[PDB]
């Protein structure tokens, strides 16, 4: 067994980059925007027909790969060319993002999800939906917070929406800007190798997954090669987590083993995309001061970090009891089965 300790790195070629750009432009002209119901309905057809063949092959292989050798993450280096001057300054927060300017990127990202094959979705739990594509920008008003809008503190490794029974299957993180040279942290359940006594206790549905309350298993799926639902900040380093002495102990014993396996080697460049199997690989990023980097004992001022996130589900059927009646891509789940009580 070759235990995976790092993600697969794919160096995108100039020809691939040029195909993606032309195909992105074409889809913008044809459908207006990536949330067009006609485009979403024929997504997989557009993905398999319009993407560079090597991208399609990589993502198809990845979608059904849950083997011992599979890390659960891919870095697509130089997927897109970002013209920094055209992009202009980073808005003060995600609310200031110009999705008219990010439209082509949303098309490109949705094609990658559609080749898994997987369908982009939105969550009421995340910005009351906020669309299929989210701009992740450091907000000065939320500098030391444990969110995507944060900066000043370490964003602990977590799988996305550990508190939801219908959390994303796949995630894409498109880096438009990372001039602060913030490392992206990744953690795979596969980095542990063979099933062990510490891991086995996590299959027990005795754990709190904060958004008494309902409990769930941290490990699920196959007993030998499991899937993971984990949030270190929310489940372990939270005074209000409400874990039992037994569960907290198990989580702590697990965190001790897991923290040595966290990979912080990759520093994304502008135009890089990280593609994640949200059932295998947790993500985070180190602390940073937005709009600056330190080099040879001097402060270098720069444009603020800007990343685009897209989430997807492989089945609209399984999630149908938690989606909107008139939108099967809009997840209304609040906490482990419970739906948001709105009206
Ligand atoms: O900034 C990052 O790379 C990760 C932020 C994050 O946790 C997210 O978009 O879910
Ligand atoms: Fe996240």
Residue numbers in the entry: 19 to 229, 241 to 372
Please share text taken word for word from the publication where this structure appeared.
We have focused our work on the iron(II)/α-KetoAcid-dependent Oxygenases (αKAOs), a mechanistically diverse superfamily of enzymes that use dioxygen as the oxidant to catalyze several reactions via C-H bond activation, mostly hydroxylation. One of these, KDO1, catalyzes the formation of (3S)-3-hydroxy-L-lysine, while five others, KDO2 to KDO6, promote the formation of (4R)-4-hydroxy-L-lysine. We based our analysis on the structures that we solved by X-ray crystallography of two of the regiodivergent αKAOs active towards L-lysine, namely KDO1 from Catenulispora acidiphila, that catalyzes the C-3 hydroxylation, and KDO5, from Flavobacterium sp., that catalyzes the C-4 hydroxylation.
In all four molecules of each of the KDO5 structures, an iron ion is present in the active site chelated by two His (176 and 312) and one Glu (178). In α-KG bound structure, α-KG is best defined for monomer A. The carboxylate moieties of the co-substrate form salt bridges with Arg338 and 334 (2.9 Å; 2.8 Å and 3.1 Å); the α-ketoacid moiety binds the iron as bidentate; the terminal carboxylate interacts by H-bond with Tyr193 (3.0 Å).
